[PDB]
Amino acid sequence: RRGALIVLEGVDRAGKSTQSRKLVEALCAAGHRAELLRFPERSTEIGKLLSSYLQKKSDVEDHSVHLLFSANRWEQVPLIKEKLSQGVTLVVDRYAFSGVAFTGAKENFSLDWCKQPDVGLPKPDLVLFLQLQLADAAKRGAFGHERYENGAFQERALRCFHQLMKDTTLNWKMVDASKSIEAVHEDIRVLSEDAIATATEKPLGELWK
Amino acid sequence: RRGALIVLEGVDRAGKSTQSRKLVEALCAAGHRAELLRFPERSTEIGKLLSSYLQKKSDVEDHSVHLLFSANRWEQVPLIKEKLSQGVTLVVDRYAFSGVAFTGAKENFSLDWCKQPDVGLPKPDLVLFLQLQLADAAKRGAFGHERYENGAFQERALRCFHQLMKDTTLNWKMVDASKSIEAVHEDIRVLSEDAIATATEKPLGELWK
Ligand SMILES: Nc1ncnc2c1ncn2[C@@H]1O[C@H](COP(=O)(O)OP(=O)(O)NP(=O)(O)O)[C@@H](O)[C@H]1O
Ligand SMILES: Nc1ncnc2c1ncn2[C@@H]1O[C@H](COP(=O)(O)OP(=O)(O)NP(=O)(O)O)[C@@H](O)[C@H]1O
Ligand SMILES: Cc1cn([C@H]2CC[C@@H](COP(=O)(O)O)O2)c(=O)[nH]c1=O
Ligand SMILES: Cc1cn([C@H]2CC[C@@H](COP(=O)(O)O)O2)c(=O)[nH]c1=O
Ligand SMILES: [Mg+2]
Ligand SMILES: [Mg+2]
Ligand SMILES: [Mg+2]
Numbered sequence: 001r002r003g004a005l006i007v008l009e010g011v012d013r014a015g016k017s018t019q020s021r022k023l024v025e026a027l028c029a030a031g032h033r034a035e036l037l038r039f040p041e042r043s044t045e046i047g048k049l050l051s052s053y054l055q056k057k058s059d060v061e062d063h064s065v066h067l068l069f070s071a072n073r074w075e076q077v078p079l080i081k082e083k084l085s086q087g088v089t090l091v092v093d094r095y096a097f098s099g100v101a102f103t104g105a106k107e108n109f110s111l112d113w114c115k116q117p118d119v120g121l122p123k124p125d126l127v128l129f130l131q132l133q134l135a136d137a138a139k140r141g142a143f144g145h146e147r148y149e150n151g152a153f154q155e156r157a158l159r160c161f162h163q164l165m166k167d168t169t170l171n172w173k174m175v176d177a178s179k180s181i182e183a184v185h186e187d188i189r190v191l192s193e194d195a196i197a198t199a200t201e202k203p204l205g206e207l208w209k
Numbered sequence: 210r211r212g213a214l215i216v217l218e219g220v221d222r223a224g225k226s227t228q229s230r231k232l233v234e235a236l237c238a239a240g241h242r243a244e245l246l247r248f249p250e251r252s253t254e255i256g257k258l259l260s261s262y263l264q265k266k267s268d269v270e271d272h273s274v275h276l277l278f279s280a281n282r283w284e285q286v287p288l289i290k291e292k293l294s295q296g297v298t299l300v301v302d303r304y305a306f307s308g309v310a311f312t313g314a315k316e317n318f319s320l321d322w323c324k325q326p327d328v329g330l331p332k333p334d335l336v337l338f339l340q341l342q343l344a345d346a347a348k349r350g351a352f353g354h355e356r357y358e359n360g361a362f363q364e365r366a367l368r369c370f371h372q373l374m375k376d377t378t379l380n381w382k383m384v385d386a387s388k389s390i391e392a393v394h395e396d397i398r399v400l401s402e403d404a405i406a407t408a409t410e411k412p413l414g415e416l417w418k
């Protein structure tokens with residue numbers, strides 16, 4: 001009985017990390033085997049290049065960095081497939097969607113080109129998109145100092161996210177991330193319990209193919 | 210008057226590195242501004258991951274390593290465009306073709322998927338393919354100990370190379386690499402002088418688009 005692959009995507013400060021963490025804790029408290037993953041995963045060789053780039057300690061050509069973000073997901077595929085096959089549900093804090101939306105926000109990057117490297121990755125059974133008015137998201141304190149942490153770039157990534165959501169091959173679920181942390185959690189949790197109960201029914205798919 | 214982008218591809222031990230070196234020396238002796246590049250370029254962060262992988266000091270998931278080889282070319286695009294625009298012809302010892310042929314030789318890698326990351330790179334004005342009977346190429350001493358240095362894998366990369374050569378958007382030129390080092394050089398050199406003289410006539414193209 002395989003585990004489910006559940007991804008959280010969403011506007012900046014939309015609550016992806018808080019909800020990913022709470023979701024795993026709640027699933028495990030309700031007797032599921034669930035573990036948390038995030039992207040980028042900064043602990044590998046690739047991830048350390050990505051962390052330095054996001055912190056602006058290094059500059060990386062735009063196509064190269066896009067490919068490194070994708071490679072960073074592929075290096076985890078063997079582990080993802082193994083965990084799911086063993087019945088462990090995986091909750092993932094950002095995935096290929098963020099990859100495509102962020103590079104796709106830069107000038108002269110087509111969505112098609114941005115998606116290709118991630119074609120074939122493990123297909124999520126559930127993709128939650130935490131929706132929040134960009135302005136309320138900036139009221140969630142203030143912008144950090146990493147790359148992309150500005151208003152104009154975020155609006156352009158949001159547009160790309162909306163294009164990806166026309167992709168009917170994927171089980172997208174909109175979440176109203178403007179509610180309290182606990183109210184948002186309870187929405188996410190019920191949609192996740194549903195997905196887990198149906199993921200044991202059809203094999204793990206392949207993304208964008 | 211832009212420089213030309215000339216790539217050498219070819220079967221193992223076909224003579225790509227020797228000819229790349231001789232070609233640059235001859236072009237410069239004949240008053241051209243020409244410089245040598247190679248892929249993978251093992252001096253960058255990415256290139257050191259690639260060198261360790263090829264030497265088998267490290268194992269890398271197959272999709273991730275394919276993307277790293279491509280990223281390794283994109284990190285050099287800014288320099289490639291700048292050099293060509295300044296009138297410097299660039300002689301390149303392996304390029305995206307080797308990227309696609311080598312991963313494309315592994316099971317379950319489609320040529321389409323393998324080409325995507327390199328879509329958009331600077332399009333070579335001339336692609337020389339050094340042809341040699343795989344057996345005569347093994348008579349060029351013996352196999353080293355790096356990855357892919359075996360007979361069965363080389364035949365499968367050669368097949369992929371032949372599929373890429375049906376790509377009429379590219380100026381492929383077959384070279385008979387079984388002749389002497391000097392005879393092969395003289396063939397390559399004349400085809401290169403021709404390409405350089407025509408590359409000042411149309412803008413640098415984009416690969417596979
Ligand atoms: N529903 C919520 N209401 C109010 N504040 C929240 C809510 N969810 C999270 N926060 C706070 O807002 C900040 C961002 O939350 P976080 O879960 O880190 O978002 P995130 O989407 O992962 N951000 P990022 O990784 O920067 O895109 C943190 O201080 C959270 O405590
Ligand atoms: N035309 C030739 N005839 C005979 N030996 C040659 C010829 N060209 C190169 N060699 C020798 O064959 C070996 C391989 O040459 P090299 O130029 O390094 O090939 P290469 O294609 O770059 N190999 P690789 O990088 O391993 O695919 C070297 O010892 C060369 O001196
Ligand atoms: C997964 C992924 C992410 N991104 C961006 C989103 C914001 C930043 C991470 O920020 P956090 O580490 O704070 O989640 O990195 C990309 O540009 N491409 C990708 O493939
Ligand atoms: C450019 C490139 C190369 N290759 C392989 C060809 C043989 C080895 C390099 O060997 P040499 O360093 O000895 O040329 O690396 C890939 O697998 N993908 C690529 O994108
Ligand atoms: Mg977060
Ligand atoms: Mg060589
Ligand atoms: Mg396509």
